[PDB]
Every structure is written in C-alpha cells, then in structure tokens.
Amino acid sequence: RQEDKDDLDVTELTNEDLLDQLVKYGVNPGPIVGTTRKLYEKKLLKLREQGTESRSS
Numbered sequence: 001r002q003e004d005k006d007d008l009d010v011t012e013l014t015n016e017d018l019l020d021q022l023v024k025y026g027v028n029p030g031p032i033v034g035t036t037r038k039l040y041e042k043k044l045l046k047l048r049e050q051g052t053e054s055r056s057s
Helices: 019-025 037-043
Strands: none
Touching: 019 037
C-alpha cells in the first residue's frame, strides 16, 4: 500500500533533508540553494512519482 509517492511536499521541503530524496533515487543535484528545491521538487519526482508502468527508461 503506497498511496501517493511524491505526496511529501517535495517543494516546501528543506534542503539538507531533501538531499536524501535525490541522493538516493540515483539523483545528485549538488548545490540545493534556496532557488533549487523547487527545481528538484520535480526533477526527483520523475523518479519518485509513484512510477507508472514497469520500466525505467
């Protein structure tokens, strides 16, 4: 039972704490300035949007 995946506010989220959402799905942003979280709020959600089918590119 997953129910929603990106449900976690991937945007208001903090910086030191979202580094786990990106650095683990295989995402390495680096500089998560106060202007990036919004950016990575979706970049990582593509790899965290409750997937969809059964393939990974």
